[PDB]
Design a protein around this nucleic acid. Structure first.
Ligand SMILES: Nc1nc2c(ncn2[C@@H]2O[C@H](COP(=O)(O)CP(=O)(O)OP(=O)(O)O)[C@@H](O)[C@H]2O)c(=O)[nH]1
Lengths: 620, 245, 710
RNA sequence: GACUGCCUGUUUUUGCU
RNA sequence: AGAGAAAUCAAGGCAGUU
C-alpha cells in the first residue's frame, strides 16, 4: 500500500501521526504529509552550521524533545501551529505548504515564515531565495516522482482537495457488513419508513377505585417446622465456671451424661459419638480432629456418589421434563410463642459494643441515643439469641479455611459480667471444599434446648444432659450451610439498626417539636393489636420490632424477599387510605396476586400475612 | 548518576523479556495499565474473613529488611506471586512487624503524605461549635463544593496545573497558559519532599485532592460555604442544626 | 404485620424501613439458566399478538404493529411506527437545549473518545477464549486480532476501533494466532534476582502458539453472541433472573450511543436515570402550588421492560433525532449499528434443560425431545438461539428511558413525569377527576404504543397527591430516609484495613447525608462496623496477629490492630492516621515508619474505587486514606493454574514490566492520558535520550550512557 | 475402574448495565 | 441424610501407575 517514492522509514513514522482511516481520502492525506516530511528531510541533508546541523526537523517528532530544542534556541511555539523545521543560520522557522497557485503569497503566520511550492516542483520566490539550489533540484525530482505516481492512480482531485483544506471525519459501512446487518430487520441502516407521523387514538379501559384493602390468602397444609440454622428463642446456656473455652469444654465433657430422649430419622442418634470425640479433642487442646467412622453419616461423606449410584440403579423409562414441587404449609403455632419468649426480660446486657470517641456536643448526643437504645434492647432474649448467632457464625466462618478435610470444633461460649462461661452449644465444621456461592459446607450443630416439641423440631435429635444436679436438653441436627449465609450471619448484629431507626425518629421528632432532647421519652403508640386498637409504649414496640426483624432475617428466602417487595405497595395503599385518600388502579390490577404468589411455606411470611389479615380493610 | 544507568538497564531488560509488549502503541498504556487476571472487586466483602486467615494471605514485594523468620514466625515466602513479576506473598503480621522494626523515612515526607488530611483535621479542631437547637428543619440538597481547596481552579485546567507542578519540562506552551499560576508554587512548596520518582504516584493524588473541586449534593439549611460542607453530616439534619461561627 | 403499621406518633411510611429483610441471606440462583433464558426469549414472541401465536410471531423482523393490534388489557410487544416518528419529533421540538448539547457532543466530544475507555468495564464475553474475561484482557486481545487481520495500527480513538470492527467483517476469513501453555500441570522454578542465602524463585511456563480460524459468518455470530449468566444476590423477587454481557466487538458501538443518550438525559427535566438527576424529584414533590385542583400521583413499574421493547423503534427514534439536528449520514450509520446487531442477537443458552428419569436428571439441549419451548427450536444456532423481538437484558437503560420520555411528550398529557428504566413516577395536575382519569389512561396507552407496558398490579394512583414511591424512596409530604437499603453495605470490604475503614466511614456518612441515617443510627452503624472491622482483621480475642503483637511487644496503635476507636460521628471525613497524630496517638516514630515510601507491603492505588452493594448499579467511592504500610492487597487467586489459558499470566507480568518502565520516564501519564503518537519502544528510547541529555553530567559520561541503550 | 502424588477454594460457561 | 427451592451442593481436576 506504500507508494514507491515514499521511503519505508517515513511511511512507518507516518503510520500513527494522524488517524488516516477515519478521514476523507485518508491515504491521500497520508501521502501528502509524507511528501512534506520528505521535503523537510531533503532540506536538511548533511547541511551543517557551526558544529550542529543547519536545519532541525520539528515535524513528526516527540513534543518534549521539540520543547527541549526550542528552549535551547530560546524560542517557544504553540502546539497547534508549530513550525515544520527551524533554521539556526538565519534564526527563522519554516513550514512546508504544498499549494497549487504559487501566486497567493499571503503569509500564513507571523511566527514562522512559510514555504510554499506549486506542487509542480517550483518554489515561491521567497522560498527560492532562502534555499540553496541542490535542495531545489532534490525537491524537483521528488515531486516529479510524486506526480507521476499520482497520475498513475488518478488522484489529482483528491490531492488538490487535501492541499486545499483540512481533514474531515468520516465513518464507512461496507457493502458486505451492511447485508449481514440487514438480515433481521425490514428497514435499512438509516430507516426511512413511508408513513405519515401521527399518534393514533386507541380506546383503553377504565380505572377502578380500590374500595377495600386486599385480603391475602392464608395457605393450608401441615404447619411449618422451624428451619433456621440455630434454635432461636428455645436456646439456653450452661453457666460454666470462669475460665477459657478449653477449660469450660473440659468441664462439660468430664461432668456430663448423654442419653437419647428423642431420636429423629433425619439425624441418627449414632452421631453423638462425633460430638463426644470433638468435645474430648477440644478439651485436650487441639480444636481439629481426624475422621471417625460415624463422620460418614454425620457429614454426608461420599453422599453424592452413593445417591448417583442409587439413581442409576433405579430409573424410569421416559426422560420427562423436570417439575419441582414446593410443599404448601400453613402458619405454625410456634411463631407467636417465639415472638413472646424473644421479648422476655433478661438480667444482663447482651449487646456489648465499644463506644466511639466524643469530641463535639453533637458526638455526645449521638452516643446518648445509642446508649439508651442498647439499654432498651440489650436485656432481652432476642439480644441473647442475636449474640449467640453472631459468635456461632463468626467462629464457624473464621475457622472456615474453606479448604479443609478434617472436622473442626467451634464452641459457642459467651461470658457474663461475672466472668462465668456460658456454653450455648458447639458447631462442628466438617469436610468442606466450597468454591461456588451455592456450595454448602457440612455442619453438625449441638445446641442446648429449653423445651422439645416434635412439632417444631422434627429433624432434631434431643438428648438429656446431666451436669451437676441440673437437667439440660441437648439438640443435635445435621445441617449444611453455605459460605454466603455464614458471611451474612457473621454480621447479624446489623439487625439492630432497623429497630433503632424507628426509636431514633420518634425521639428526635419529639425533641424537634419540643425544641429540646429528652432521652427519657416513653410515648404511647397506637397499634391494631388482636384486631383492635391499643396503645403501647415504644419500648415494647422496638422489642417487638427487633424480634420480628430477627425472625425475618434468619428466615430470609426468595419467598420472604418477594413478599416484602410486593407488599410495600399494599402497605403504602393502607397508609393512603388512613389519610382519607382515594386509591385507583388500572384495568387488570390485582396487587395482591404478586404478594400471594410468595406465600408457600415460609412461617414468618405466613405470620406477616395473618397480621395483615387482622387489620381493618376499609377506612370509612 | 546511577539512576540513569538503572533506567537504561531496566529499559534493556524490558525490551529483551517483552519484545511484543514493547512493539505496542504508547496510546495503549491507557488500557494495559489495568491488564490483570485478578478479580478482587468481585464481591470482596464475602471473602475477607477467611482470606486474611489463609496461609500467606498478604502481598508484599521482595525486600531485604524483612527477615524470613522473626521470633519463630515465618514472615515471607521465597516464591514470587502468581501473575506478579515484582511482588510475592508474606504473612499477615508483616505490617505489624514493620510498624515497630521497619525503616524510617524523613520527618518532611510524613508532613507531605499527610498534608491534606492534616489540614482537614486542623479545620475540624479549630471551630467553636455553637449550641444544638432542635426543630423541624428542612434540609434541601444543592450542588456544593465538598472540601476546601488551596486555590480556586477551573476543573478543566487541573491536569494542566498539576503538570507544571510535577513535570514542567514535559509540556507545551498551551498547557502553560491553561494553568492557574498561583496554585502551582504553593503545591510545589508543599509537595517538594515527595516529588521524587518513587512517591510521584502518590503525590499527584493528594495534590489533586488539595486542588480539585467536586460538586456534590449535600443537605443544608443555610447556604454552605466550601468549608462548612465537608462537615455537613453532623451540622444539619431533619431534626437538628448547629450554627458554626 | 400489624406491628409495622403505626396509628400514632410516626406514619406508616416512616416504617417502610421495616419492610426490608436485608440482614439475612440474599437469594442465590441454582443450576442451569437455560430455562430462565428460554422463558425470557419466548415472552416477546408471546405478547406481539393480542391472542398468543408464537409460530406466526417468529417471522417478524421489525416489530411494527397497527393501533388496533395493541393489546390494551395485557402486555403488548412491539411498537407503532407513525407514533414513534411523531413522538420523537415532539420530543425534539421541546427540550431543544438538550438537542443542542447533543449536537455539541457529536461534533466535539464524539471525535475525541478513546477506545481505552472500554477497559474500565467488567467481565466481558471473549469471542476468542469463549469465556468471560476482564475488560482489559478482552480489549487487548480484540485489538491484537484487529491489528493483525487488518494489517494496520488502530487509532487511539473509539471511532478508529469502530471503523476497524466494521472493516474486519468485510474479510472472508480471519485468524488469531494466540499463545497458551502446552502443559499447565508442570510448574518449573528458576532463581531470579537472588542467589544470596534468601532465594527468590518464580514460576516459568511454556508458551506455544495456536491459531483459530473465523469465517465471516462465525465472526458475525461471535459479534452477535451474548453470554448469559445468573444474577446472583438479587433482592426483592421470588424468581431468579438472567443477565448477559455483549462481546467487545459491539461494546464501542454501544458506548457511543449510551454516551449520547446520557448527554441528552442529563438535560431533560423528566429523566431520573442520572444519579445527579435524582434530586429534581425532591423538588417535584415539594411543588405544592396546587390550588383547588384534582392533583393525583401515580407511582408504578413497567412489566417486561426488556422483553416488550424492539431495537428498531429505538433505532428509529435515534435516526429521527440525528436527522432533525442536522448531521452527516455516517452519524446516522453509526448510531444504528448497535440496534441492528441487537436485532440479530444470538443469546447464549445454558448447559441444557433439566430432564428427569425417575430420580436422576440429565442436562440436555433444547432440540432433544419435546419441552415447553419447542417453538423456538427453529431459532437455535449451535448452543445459542436468536431472538429478534425484545432486548433480553438492560444494556440500554439510557436509550430505553429516552424512548419512554419521547412517549411521554404529548399535548393532552400536562403532568410531570420522572422516568428511570423500569421504575417511574407521574404527577397529575387537572381540574376534575375525570380529566385525571383520561390523562392516566392516555399515559398507559401511550407507553403501550412504543411497548413500555405499565404493570397493572404494580402501579397505584393516589387521588390526593403526596404519597408515592420511586426507586425505594418513599414520599409523604417529603422523602424520608430508608436505612434498610444501606445495611448490605455496612460490612467491611475486602481490600485492606485502611481502605476498608475509609469506605465504611464514607458509606455511613453518605447514608447520613441522604437522610437515610441520623445521629443514633449513624453512631450505632459506626459501632457495629468497628466491631466487624476488628473481628475481620484478626484484632479480637486470642488470634495469630494479637499473639505476634504480644510476644514481640508490638503495641496496638491502629483500630485494625485492636486499639480503641478514634473516629466519631463528627470525625467521619477525617483520616485515622492524621486524627491519631493530632490527638497524640502516633507520636513521630511509627508515623515515620509506617508511612515510609520504602514499605515492601504497601501498594499504590486510586482515590476512586469500585463499590457495588449486591449486584446493584455500580458506584464510585472516594478513598483518601494515606498509603501506609497497612494499605496492602490480598494474595492472588491461584485457580488459573492447571488451565490451558494460564499464559495470560506471562502476558500480564510482561505488561506490568512495561508499565513499570513507564510511569518512571513518563510522569505525565499520572496526570492525563497518554497521547504520544508512536510505539512504546520508540517513545521510551526518546525519553531516555531526553532525560540523559537534559541531565547535568560530563558529555563523555553522557555518550557512554547512551552507548548502553540498545 | 481405583490409587499413588500434585493443584485449587471468586477465575469452572457464571457479579452485566 | 441434610441444606434447599423451580435446581444445585453434598469436593473437583491433572500427572503417573494400573
Ligand atoms: N442490565 C441490568 N438491567 C437491570 C438490572 N436490574 C434491573 N434492570 C433493569 O430494570 C428492569 C427490570 O424490570 P423487568 O424487565 O424485570 C420487569 P418487572 O420489574 O415488572 O418484573 P416482572 O413483573 O417479573 O416482569 C429491566 O429493564 C432490567 O433490564 C441489572 O442489574 N442489570
Amino acid at each position: 500500500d506504500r507508494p514507491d517514492h515514499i521511503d519505508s522509514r517515513v511511511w512507518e513514522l507516518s503510520e500513527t501521526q494522524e488517524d488516516w482511516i477515519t478521514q476523507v481520502h485518508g491515504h491521500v492525506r497520508r501521502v501528502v504529509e509524507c511528501w512534506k516530511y520528505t521535503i523537510c528531510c531533503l532540506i536538511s541533508n548533511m547541511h551543517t552550521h557551526r558544529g550542529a546541523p543547519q536545519y532541525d526537523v520539528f515535524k513528526w517528532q516527540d513534543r518534549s524533545t521539540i520543547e527541549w530544542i526550542c528552549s535551547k534556541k530560546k524560542v517557544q511555539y504553540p502546539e497547534r501551529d508549530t513550525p515544520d523545521l527551524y533554521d539556526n543560520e538565519r534564526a527563522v522557522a519554516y513550514k512546508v505548504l504544498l499549494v497549487s497557485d504559487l501566486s497567493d503569497h499571503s503569509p500564513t503566520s507571523g511566527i514562522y515564515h512559510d514555504l510554499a511550492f506549486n506542487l509542480e516542483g517550483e518554489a515561491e520566490e521567497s522560498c527560492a531565495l532562502v534555499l540553496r539550489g541542490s535542495q531545489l533540484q532534490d525537491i524537483k525530482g521528488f515531486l516529479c516522482r510524486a506526480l507521476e505516481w499520482v497520475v498513475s492512480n488518478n488522484l489529482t482531485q483528491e490531492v488538490v482537495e487535501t492541499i486545499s483544506g483540512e481533514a474531515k471525519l468520516q465513518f464507512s459501512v461496507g457493502t458486505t457488513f451492511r447485508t449481514l446487518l440487514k438480515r433481521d430487520t425490514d428497514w435499512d441502516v438509516i430507516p426511512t419508513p413511508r408513513v405519515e407521523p401521527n399518534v393514533p387514538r386507541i380506546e383503553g379501559r377504565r380505572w377502578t377505585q380500590m374500595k377495600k384493602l386486599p385480603l391475602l390468602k392464608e395457605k393450608e397444609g401441615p404447619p411449618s417446622p422451624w428451619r433456621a440454622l440455630l434454635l432461636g428463642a428455645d436456646s439456653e446456656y450452661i453457666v460454666c465456671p470462669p475460665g477459657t473455652d478449653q477449660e469450660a469444654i473440659s468441664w462439660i465433657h468430664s461432668q456430663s451424661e448423654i442419653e437419647c430422649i428423642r431420636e429423629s430419622k433425619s439425624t441418627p442418634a449414632s452421631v453423638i459419638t462425633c460430638l463426644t470425640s470433638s468435645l474430648q479433642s477440644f478439651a485436650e487442646g487441639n480444636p481439629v480432629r481426624s475422621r471417625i467412622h460415624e463422620d460418614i453419616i454425620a457429614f454426608g461423606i461420599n453422599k453424592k456418589q452413593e445417591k448417583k449410584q442409587s439413581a442409576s440403579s433405579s430409573a424410569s423409562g421416559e426422560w420427562k421434563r423436570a417439575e419441582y414441587q414446593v410443599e404448601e404449609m400453613s402458619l405454625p403455632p410456634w411463631v407467636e410463642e417465639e415472638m413472646v419468649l424473644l421479648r422476655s426480660d433478661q438480667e444482663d446486657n447482651w449487646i456489648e459494643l465499644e463506644k466511639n470517641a466524643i469530641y463535639t456536643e453533637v458526638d455526645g448526643v449521638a452516643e446518648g441515643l445509642v446508649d439508651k437504645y442498647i439499654e432498651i434492647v440489650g436485656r432481652t432474649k432476642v439480644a441473647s439469641v442475636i449474640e449467640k448467632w453472631q459468635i456461632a457464625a463468626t467462629r464457624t466462618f473464621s475457622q472456615l479455611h474453606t479448604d479443609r478435610s478434617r472436622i473442626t470444633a467451634c464452641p459457642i461460649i459467651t461470658r457474663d459480667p461475672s466472668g462465668n462461661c456460658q456454653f450455648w452449644g458447639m458447631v462442628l465444621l466438617g469436610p468442606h471444599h466450597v468454591k461456588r456461592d451455592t456450595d454448602n459446607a457440612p455442619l453438625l450443630i449441638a445446641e442446648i434446648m429449653g423445651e422439645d416439641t416434635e412439632e417444631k423440631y422434627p429433624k432434631h435429635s434431643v438428648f438429656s444432659l446431666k451436669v451437676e444436679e441440673k437437667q439440660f436438653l441437648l439438640s443435635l441436627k445435621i445441617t449444611s450451610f453455605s459460605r454466603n449465609k455464614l458471611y451474612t450471619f457473621s454480621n447479624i448484629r446489623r439487625v439492630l439498626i432497623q429497630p433503632a431507626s424507628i426509636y431514633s425518629q420518634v425521639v428526635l421528632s419529639r425533641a424537634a417539636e419540643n425544641n429540646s432532647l429528652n432521652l427519657e421519652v416513653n410515648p404511647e403508640i397506637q397499634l391494631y393489636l388482636e384486631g383492635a386498637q391499643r396503645g403501647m409504649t415504644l419500648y415494647q414496640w422496638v422489642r417487638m420490632i427487633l424480634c420480628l426483624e430477627f425472625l425475618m432475617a434468619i428466615y430470609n428466602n426468595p419467598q420472604m424477599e418477594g413478599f416484602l417487595a410486593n407488599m410495600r405497595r399494599l402497605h403504602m395503599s393502607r397508609h393512603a387510605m388512613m389519610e382519607r385518600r382515594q386509591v385507583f388502579l388500572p384495568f387488570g390490577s390485582r396487587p395482591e396476586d404478586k404478594v400471594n404468589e410468595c406465600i408457600i411455606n415460609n412461617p414468618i411470611v405466613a405470620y406477616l400475612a395473618k397480621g395483615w389479615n387482622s387489620m381493618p380493610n376499609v377506612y370509612y | 548518576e546511577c539512576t540513569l544507568r538503572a533506567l537504561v538497564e531496566e529499559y534493556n531488560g524490558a525490551c529483551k523479556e517483552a519484545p511484543k509488549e514493547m512493539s505496542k502503541q504508547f496510546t495503549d498504556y491507557n488500557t494495559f495499565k489495568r491488564y490483570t487476571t485478578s478479580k478482587k472487586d468481585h464481591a470482596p466483602q464475602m471473602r475477607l474473613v477467611y482470606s486474611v486467615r489463609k496461609p500467606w494471605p498478604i502481598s508484599m514485594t521482595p525486600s531485604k529488611e524483612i527477615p524470613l523468620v522473626f521470633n519463630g514466625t515465618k514472615l515471607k515466602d521465597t516464591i514470587l506471586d502468581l501473575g506478579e513479576s515484582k511482588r510475592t506473598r508474606a504473612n499477615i503480621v508483616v505490617p505489624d512487624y514493620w510498624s515497630k522494626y521497619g525503616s524510617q523515612t524523613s520527618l518532611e515526607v510524613v508532613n507531605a503524605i499527610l498534608y491534606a488530611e492534616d489540614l482537614k483535621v486542623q479545620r475540624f479542631f479549630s471551630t467553636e461549635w455553637g449550641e444544638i437547637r432542635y426543630g423541624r428543619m428542612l434540609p434541601f440538597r444543592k450542588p456544593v463544593q465538598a472540601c476546601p481547596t488551596i486555590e480556586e481552579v477551573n476543573p478543566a485546567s487541573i491536569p494542566h496545573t498539576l503538570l507544571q507542578v510535577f513535570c514542567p519540562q514535559y509540556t507545551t506552551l498551551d498547557s502553560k497558559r491553561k494553568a492557574h499560576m498561583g496554585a502551582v508554587e504553593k503545591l510545589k512548596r508543599v509537595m517538594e519532599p515527595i516529588c521524587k520518582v518513587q512517591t510521584q504516584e502518590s503525590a499527584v493524588h493528594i495534590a489533586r485532592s488539595l486542588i480539585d473541586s467536586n460538586k456534590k449534593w449535600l443537605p443544608t439549611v443555610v447556604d454552605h460555604t466550601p468549608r462548612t460542607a465537608e462537615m455537613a453530616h453532623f451540622l444539619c439534619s431533619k431534626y437538628h442544626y448547629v450554627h458554626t461561627n | 404485620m400489624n406491628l409495622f403499621t403505626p396509628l400514632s406518633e410516626i406514619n406508616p411510611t416512616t416504617t417502610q424501613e421495616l419492610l426490608y429483610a436485608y440482614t439475612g441471606p440474599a437469594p442465590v440462583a441454582y443450576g442451569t439458566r437455560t430455562r430462565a433464558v428460554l422463558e425470557n426469549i419466548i415472552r416477546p414472541y408471546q405478547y406481539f399478538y393480542k391472542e398468543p401465536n408464537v409460530q406466526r410471531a417468529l417471522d417478524i423482523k421489525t416489530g411494527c404493529k397497527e393501533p388496533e393490534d395493541i393489546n390494551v388489557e395485557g402486555p403488548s410487544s412491539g411498537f407503532h411506527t407513525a407514533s414513534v416518528l411523531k413522538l420523537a419529533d415532539n420530543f425534539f421540538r421541546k427540550y431543544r437545549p438538550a438537542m443542542e448539547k447533543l449536537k455539541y457532543w457529536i461534533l466535539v466530544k464524539l471525535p475525541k473518545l478513546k477506545y481505552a475507555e472500554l477497559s474500565k468495564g467488567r467481565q466481558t464475553y471473549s469471542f476468542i477464549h469463549k469465556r468471560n474475561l476482564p475488560a482489559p484482557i478482552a480489549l487487548e486481545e480484540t485489538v491484537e486480532f484487529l491489528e493483525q487481520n487488518l494489517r494496520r495500527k488502530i487509532g487511539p480513538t473509539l471511532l478508529s476501533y469502530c471503523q476497524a470492527i466494521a472493516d474486519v467483517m468485510e474479510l472472508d476469513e480471519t485468524t488469531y494466532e494466540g499463545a497458551r501453555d502446552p502443559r499447565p500441570w508442570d510448574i518449573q522454578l528458576e532463581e531470579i534476582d537472588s542467589d544470596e542465602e534468601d532465594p527468590l524463585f518464580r514460576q516459568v511456563g511454556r508458551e506455544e502458539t495456536y491459531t483459530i480460524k473465523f469465517s465471516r459468518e462465525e465472526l458475525w455470530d461471535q459479534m452477535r453472541t451474548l453470554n448469559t449468566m445468573w444474577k446472583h444476590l438479587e433482592r426483592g423477587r421470588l424468581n431468579r433472573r438472567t443477565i448477559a454481557t455483549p462481546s467487545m466487538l459491539i461494546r464501542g458501538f454501544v458506548k457511543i450511543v449510551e454516551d449520547a443518550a446520557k448527554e441528552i438525559l442529563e438535560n431533560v427535566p423528566t429523566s431520573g436515570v442520572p444519579v445527579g438527576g435524582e434530586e429534581k424529584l425532591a423538588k417535584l414533590a415539594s411543588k405544592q402550588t396546587f390550588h383547588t385542583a384534582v392533583t393525583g400521583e401515580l407511582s408504578g413499574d413497567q412489566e417486561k421492560f426488556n422483553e416488550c421493547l424492539d431495537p428498531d423503534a429505538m433505532r428509529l427514534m435515534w435516526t429521527v433525532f440525528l436527522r432533525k439536528l442536522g448531521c452527516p449520514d455516517w452519524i446516522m450509520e453509526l448510531f444504528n449499528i448497535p440496534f441492528m446487531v441487537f436485532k440479530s442477537k444470538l443469546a447464549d443458552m445454558g448447559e441444557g434443560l433439566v430432564y428427569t428419569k425417575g430420580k436422576l436428571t440429565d442436562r440436555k439441549p433444547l432440540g432433544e425431545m419435546p419441552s415447553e419451548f419447542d417453538d423456538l427450536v427453529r431459532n437455535v444456532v449451535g448452543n445459542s438461539i436468536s431472538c429478534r423481538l425484545g432486548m433480553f437484558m438492560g444494556m440500554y437503560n439510557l436509550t430505553s428511558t429516552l424512548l419512554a420520555l419521547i412517549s411521554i411528550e404529548r399535548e393532552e398529557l400536562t403532568g410531570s413525569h420522572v422516568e428511570s428504566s423500569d421504575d417511574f413516577i407521574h404527577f397529575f395536575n387537572c381540574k376534575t377527576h375525570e380529566e385525571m382519569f383520561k390523562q392516566a389512561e392516555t399515559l398507559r396507552l401511550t407507553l403501550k404504543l412504543v411497548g413500555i407496558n405499565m404493570s397493572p398490579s404494580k402501579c397505584i394512583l393516589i387521588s390526593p397527591a403526596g404519597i408515592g414511591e420511586f426507586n425505594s424512596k418513599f414520599h409523604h409530604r417529603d422523602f424520608v430516609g430508608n436505612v434498610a437499603t444501606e445495611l448490605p453495605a455496612l460490612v467491611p470490604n475486602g481490600t485492606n484495613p485502611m481502605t476498608d475503614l475509609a469506605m465504611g466511614l464514607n458509606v455511613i456518612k453518605h447514608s447520613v447525608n441522604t437522610g437515610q441515617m441520623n445521629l443514633c443510627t449513624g453512631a450505632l452503624a459506626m459501632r457495629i462496623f468497628n466491631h466487624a472491622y476488628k473481628y475481620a482483621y484478626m484484632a479480637l480475642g486470642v488470634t495469630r496477629r494479637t499473639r505476634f503483637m504480644e510476644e514481640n511487644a508490638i503495641t496496638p496503635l491502629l483500630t485494625n490492630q485492636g486499639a480503641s476507636p478514634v473516629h466519631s460521628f463528627s470525625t467521619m471525613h477525617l483520616d485515622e492516621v492524621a486524627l491519631r497524630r493530632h490527638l497524640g496517638l502516633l507520636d513521630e516514630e511509627t508515623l515515620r515508619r509506617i508511612l515510609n515510601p520504602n514499605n515492601p507491603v504497601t501498594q499504590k492505588g486510586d482515590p476512586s474505587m469500585f463499590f457495588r452493594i449486591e449486584n446493584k448499579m455500580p458506584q464510585i467511592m472516594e478513598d483518601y486514606s494515606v498509603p501506609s504500610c497497612f494499605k496492602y492487597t490480598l494474595s492472588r487467586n491461584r485457580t488459573i493454574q492447571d488451565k490451558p489459558h494460564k499464559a495470560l499470566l506471562n502476558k500480564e507480568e510482561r505488561y506490568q514490566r512495561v508499565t513499570s518502565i513507564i510511569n518512571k520516564l513518563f510522569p505525565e501519564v499520572l496526570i492525563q492520558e497518554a497521547s504520544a503518537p508512536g510505539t512504546v519502544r520508540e517513545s521510551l528510547k526518546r525519553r531516555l535520550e531526553l532525560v540523559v541529555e537534559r541531565s547535568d553530567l560530563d558529555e563523555e559520561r553522557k555518550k557512554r550512557i547512551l552507548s548502553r541503550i540498545f
